[PDB]
Symmetry: D3
Subunit: 250 residues, 6 copies
């Protein structure tokens, strides 16, 4: 291994400069499966890496796990190995009433409710996605059919209190986040997830290209916790779109 965590050498990448980066290690194989010559490279902790081939060019799929910290490790080490473009494919909860479960969201920029982004740039720096990556995701979504929404996303270091969930061990939310969901809602924010603030800030401040798309598995104006019955369908929908977007970015 050339890096401390991922268990990868520059040779393993075979000249790849683009990585699809899902949160879930089990999703890595599914994403590689839509491409050619899918091959497992390594798996340590929450970091599972495959390589595949897209229009004859080598591409990396590598899981981040949940959160900015492990995301920050995966992105840094991939970048040491030569990755310059990063596409997160995730799952998300919508907070707007018109955004349905199954919809696909493309994040232009993120509300930074994380700590890791601050380790790369002060809060005033925008967690903004790369224009070409964002353009690639929107055009990709259009071409495969999805009902898509394009906008700002709130990116939180927690699943529970930072996304104002109250059905929890304690039933309470710290003052800073009490009433917060309603305010992001009034501000047109589309959804919550957990990694994009870190990804987007660390790439935009180090000359790396990054994009972000997620599939809606729950609407927070209905429920706190996602239903299981439609999660899998939504996941494959977003995965199809990220793979197609990668294709226009080679």
């Amino acid at each position: 291994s050339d890096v401390f965590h991922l268990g990868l050498t520059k040779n393993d990448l075979q000249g790849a400069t683009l990585a699809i980066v899902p949160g879930d290690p089990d999703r890595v194989e599914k994403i590689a499966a839509l491409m050619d010559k899918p091959v497992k490279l390594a798996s340590h902790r929450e970091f599972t890496t495959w390589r595949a081939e897209l229009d004859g060019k080598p591409v990396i799929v590598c899981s981040t796990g949940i959160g900015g910290p492990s995301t920050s490790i995966a992105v840094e080490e991939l970048a040491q190995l030569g990755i310059r473009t990063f596409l997160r494919i995730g799952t998300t909860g919508a907070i707007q009433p018109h955004i349905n479960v199954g919809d696909v969201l493309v994040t232009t920029a993120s509300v930074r409710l994380d700590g890791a982004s601050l380790h790369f740039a002060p809060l005033e720096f925008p967690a903004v996605a790369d224009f070409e990556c964002t353009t690639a995701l929107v055009e990709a979504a259009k071409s495969i059919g999805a009902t898509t929404h394009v906008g700002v996303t709130a990116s939180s270091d927690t699943f529970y209190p930072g996304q104002e969930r109250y059905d929890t061990y304690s039933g309470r939310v710290v003052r800073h986040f009490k009433g917060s969901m309603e305010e992001w809602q009034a501000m047109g924010v589309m959804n919550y997830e957990m990694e994009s603030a870190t990804l987007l800030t660390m790439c935009a401040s180090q000359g790396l290209r990054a994009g972000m798309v997620a599939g809606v598995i729950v609407n927070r104006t209905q429920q706190e916790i996602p239903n299981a019955e439609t999660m899998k369908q939504t996941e494959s929908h977003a995965v199809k779109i990220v793979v197609e977007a990668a294709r226009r970015l080679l």
Copy 2:
């Protein structure tokens, strides 16, 4: 008049929903003169407004003056009048050595070195431009063949200390902004200007579309204080972008 500062009514807009917003009130006539049936509506303080027509649809050009505060007045009061799309056209000084005088900068999002943005959303909220607006500015720049950089802009409430200029009365820069140009340079920030953090934040947080394009008049890796076929180029672009957004 239906608004406190601009001196305009809903009627005066004639159904306009898009406004091009330069900083200099003296630039407003020049921009409107590129469009059809240009007409001065009003000027009070730093806010000079003209109406024109672009492809037979009414369009507003209205100056913001320098800074987030006057900008925030103009955007709010235009929004009360029916404006939903704001395209800023500016001048700017680049901080990256590969960016030449002449060049055009389309801003995707801004470093919020301002105060007014915080009156709409806390610092964590991104001062991000609307995607259709940015797309339309990039495509308009490609249409007239300007060399274009797309990225992040540092938006400062001062011309001097916030942009780390030392050639001043006091000659010093407060600790917070000491070494700051260097940091933004290494983070790939393209340029300094003074209104986009306010504009983009207030619009992104209230359902209004905004975009920013500027022409480069100086590179800070040479000089501190600022071939004018370039302000011309940027005005041509913002107009062409407005056409695609109507």
Copy 3:
């Protein structure tokens, strides 16, 4: 031209060291007319500069525009040309029920709800007026018999949300400023305006003298948008005070 925005030279000033700084460019001519030999020097963007004479000594009257940012440009560039004393004359919205339209308010120090002041001193530094300038403004007011209040002012980068106005496009106010008017009120803050925190802070932190006076055109305990027909007898009452204070400061 010796400076980048104002369009002025050191010679234009004729050795002036005091400038009266209104916000509105269309007020500059009016203030210069209470003085001797008023002449227009320059007019660029929102910066109209005239020069007049007071007890035989040259004096600048120069508009700042709305906001700390354009105010910071005017004060700095005037300071490069030799101005050491700055007297702001403004209009303002009072937030105390005992302060009436027509009253004159002299500002001892300002609540820093602006961005530009931070570019000169950290938040903890007091946006405090120079003691001599305040003295001269208070004594000028007393000498023309104006009903005067002396205290703290809240200085906001916005006209609308930062002064907790709700009669707006969005109808709402960000968490940080919700309930804020009532807090400032209970703390004895006299009024809202938009430039004093920047002026006073940048002056007090750089060896320059500054003072602030303003006429009350509305009272926010009954109205948001000022009445149209009390912005004439008030504007001129406050202008006379700042011209008379200028005399006592030369």
Copy 4:
């Protein structure tokens, strides 16, 4: 499944109230095997959970993953299922010259260089460990004869910039963290790791007991470098401490 991420029922736990929480899911089975009747319960993402038995009583072993975010999910969902004591076990790298490889660090409290802790309490709230848990860990380490340090740990949301590592892609560290390691060293901070600020804050602010213990495998200040013995040393200590807290 009673909880969304971990894939566990209350019944899976069999009345367990104590969880040993390593970071690496691949270490869960090993720590479980050191006790009686080890049984796998689930595995999803980075959360691998085994149940085991310690002096006749049911005990949980569950990985958090790297970082406060995933840690906060594991802890919350385990708490819903009835866990009231969490003992963090890991390996780490010291930043003091007097701390040697093979030594054990018990953490009284952490410097909060993370984001998740703030979601449970404002920054002024101390990321302190529970006194009973900390005592059990110290007594456990003494009883097997480890060379031990008891003190403050800095808990970072990054492995790289937050621990002032410069051997990176960019090779630079953001202003805020520049000079930070030297400050923490002068302040007596023993080490860096990435989960304890979130674990200790969220537990101490919700009436749950938490402690942490770690083996030192590496030292930043030291040269030359060594090198499994230290991993199994700290694990024996956490297991013996769990024993005292049942």
Copy 5:
């Protein structure tokens, strides 16, 4: 005299490395008298210093006054004189319904609602007690059979608004501290006092050992102001404990 505020020389200490540091200067003689060979060393301002002997070893008792600022002076200057272990014994207000007046509260760490702690470490640093000092306090309390609680303490730069007292001249609390007692209560915070955040932060940030014990004189779940007649005996309970803990740390 070797230090500017306390009026002491190293020689006055006679090799002492441990000080008991109460808040009130009138309490110092009381604490010294429980030990052997009690001798007054000095008294300037709020700093009264006595020396005594404990199991044959010299020991300092020195008052801090109220507040982190003067606490930081006494601790810094006693440290220059060779003190390495500080044990604060104080009075305190419980905010939990199970805690009684007369009870002994041992602080593991404090919520830093103070200013002086920041002058030694940024806010993210834990105001945590030394493990040996805390251990000695707990065991000392157990040995005399005092009813004791161990946990987190809120340490406020004020007695009134920072501890959310409304029975005051103004009768109001700044928004930052409105509803704050309730949040600390829900977070399991035992109590309020005024010096521990400063003491514990400066000591832990400089390699000095510190411990914090205090007697409860009021419960804030029922009333703001402590009663008169029962304060004298609560004092005697935590004073026995802080002296006994001192014995275990020599």
Copy 6:
């Protein structure tokens, strides 16, 4: 006693609405003795209270102790008892080269390097002195011939790291305050002391009048620790001025 800490009743004050508030309890008798009919009222902790008479009116002299916290207690409890005007008299280290030992400094406003002021108003609020108290202190200084400076004061919760002293047990200053003295000095700040940020902030946000004056006992461009062999010459100069200012404010 009507108040918890100070040990005073309303009747002890005899209608007094003005208090002079030194930091040092031992200085209270000194100050009262310049006036008529001085009598000790009470002494508890660092709060020593005397009452005297100035041109026929009763006046209070009451020590604050060192620091914002105890200062906040004395001002609150005196305000409950009817005090509306507070004049602090203190000692101070000058940080400008032209300001000498023996000089008198009148503070117009303070840099808030304290914690207690935040418990009354957020940081943006200016710790500004009252205009009448300041005017009276400056004119009082003029009438007795003292060499006087009027300006901003840095008000710190510590004597040592917060005023950037390095001659200490640890020998380091925390990142936040490293180089800070040179920056306050460049910003025109005259001096360091420890109570005025709290006093002035808490009074200006509650409708109480406060003034601040101090004698310079050390110059920091030369020396960290004040030299005792020039301190009692300078203390009695400033005491004279505050008593004369109080006369003008009755």
